[PDB]
Amino acid sequence: VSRTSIYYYAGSSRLLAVGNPYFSIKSPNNNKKVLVPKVSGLQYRVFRVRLP
């Protein structure tokens, strides 16, 4: 692999997240869909970027 001097910036906007830090609350009837997702400091916040 030989490298060229052509540089390209990229940048995302402010990704946000908000919810309950203890447990996910689901809909009472539909027992597969969430209502408020569970998010704390302790999760591995692993990202998955895509490139053109």
> What residue ranges bind another protein (CB under 8 A)?
25, 28-29
Nearer to another protein, 28 or 52 (CB): 28
Minimum CB separation of residue 23 from another protein in Å reads 13
Nearer to another protein, 38 or 43 (CB): 38
Minimum CB separation of residue 28 from another protein in Å reads 6
In degrees rounded to 5, what are phi and psi of residue 23?
A: -155, 150
Return all residues near 43 (Cβ < 8 A) that are at least 6 apart: none
Burial of 39 (0-12, 13-18, 19+ CB in 10 A): middle
